[PDB]
Amino acid sequence: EVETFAFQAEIAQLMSLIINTFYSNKEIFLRELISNSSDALDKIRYESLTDPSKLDSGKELHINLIPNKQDRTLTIVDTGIGMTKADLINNLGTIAKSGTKAFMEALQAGADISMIGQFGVGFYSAYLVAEKVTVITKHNDDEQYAWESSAGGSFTVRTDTGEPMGRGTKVILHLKEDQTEYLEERRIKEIVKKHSQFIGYPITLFVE
Ligand SMILES: O=C(c1ccc(O)cc1)c1cc(Cl)ccc1O
Numbered sequence: 001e002v003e004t005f006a007f008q009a010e011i012a013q014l015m016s017l018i019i020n021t022f023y024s025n026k027e028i029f030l031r032e033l034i035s036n037s038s039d040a041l042d043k044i045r046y047e048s049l050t051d052p053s054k055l056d057s058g059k060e061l062h063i064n065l066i067p068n069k070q071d072r073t074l075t076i077v078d079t080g081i082g083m084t085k086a087d088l089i090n091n092l093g094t095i096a097k098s099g100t101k102a103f104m105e106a107l108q109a110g111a112d113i114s115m116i117g118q119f120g121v122g123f124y125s126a127y128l129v130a131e132k133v134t135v136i137t138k139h140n141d142d143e144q145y146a147w148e149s150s151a152g153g154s155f156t157v158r159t160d161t162g163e164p165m166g167r168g169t170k171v172i173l174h175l176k177e178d179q180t181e182y183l184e185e186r187r188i189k190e191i192v193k194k195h196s197q198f199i200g201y202p203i204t205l206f207v208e
Contacts, residue, residue, distance in 0.1 A: 002158045007149075010100040011091060011124070015151045018127045021113065026179065028114045029129050030065075030188070031195035032122030033076045033171055034203065037063045040080025040169060041201050047081065057140055057167035063199070065192070066206045067183040072175050074129075074182050078201075079168040082139035088147050088157060092135065095120050123171075127151055129182055132174035138165050 007015065041061045048054045058079050066075040087093040103111070103119035116125050126133045135147040144164060149155035173182075181187050188205055196203065 002156050004154055004156050005089060006154055008091070008097055010097045012153045014096070014100040014103070014121060014124055015127055018113070018116075018124055019151060023113045023128070025112075025114055026128040027182075027191045028116075028195065029125040029173075030076075030182070030191050032117045032125045034063060034192075034196045034199055035117055036123055037076060037078035037080055037169070038199050038201060040078055040082070043081040044079070044167070054140060057138070061201055063201050063203045064206060065188055065203065067185070067188065067208065069180075069183050069208060072177075072180060072183070074173045074175060074188075076171040076173075077165075077168065078170075079166070082168050083137040083145075084139045084142040085145050085157065086142075087139075088135070088137060088145055092123055092147065094123060096124075126171065126173055129175055129179040130173040131176050134170075134172035134174070136160050136163075136165065136170040136172070138167050138169075140167060 006012075041063070044054060045061060061079055064075075064077040066077065067073075068075070083093050091097070099120040103116060103121060106115060106119065107113075113125070113128075116122050132148065132150040136144065137147070138144040144160045146158050146160040147155060175182060182191075185205065185207060192203055192205065
């Protein structure tokens with residue numbers, strides 16, 4: 001059972017801007033996704049301080065970066081709070097309508113695409129390098145779901161039954177053919193060191 005949804009007009013507009021605007025500094029997508037993972041890990045950490053049972057679904061708080069050259073995918077995995085089906089559908093827990101408006105107003109006032117994260121819509125920078133994005137998530141209060149979108153104005157949501165993840169979110173980036181540099185170990189290391197060197201959770205770069 002696959003449900004298909006239309007993006008709200010402002011988000012479709014944001015995604016089209018990200019896909020069609022000439023902007024060479026695409027590497028910021030990884031900083032934005034690691035920042036989202038760090039925010040999700042802060043949330044489960046904070047909840048766990050008053051209710052330790054919130055960590056029954058996994059005590060380790062970390063981020064993994066998994067390149068796969070054969071599948072042309074870069075996966076970002078975290079053991080953060082995860083998202084309910086309701087929050088997945090509601091723009092992956094973001095204030096994407098108001099955030100898109102504020103980002104649009106900033107771009108007209110001198111901002112550049114790298115400042116996207118300041119407006120709470122950093123997730124959508126995945127579309128600088130991915131033709132398709134799959135988001136697998138598990139929140140303590142709901143079941144495991146898979147969100148997917150190749151942009152074009154719609155996304156799908158389905159229950160995910162293969163590979164239970166305990167708790168957290170997995171962002172699978174199906175890379176564009178000219179963006180395979182982001183599967184190279186030395187390139188990922190360089191971007192992590194440049195933009196995410198002080199993230200408060202261990203970041204493990206997997207090898208092949
Ligand atoms: O699960 C979350 C999430 C949940 C709540 C939250 O406030 C922030 C991010 C998640 C969302 C994205 Cl899009 C990427 C990584 C993630 O860890």
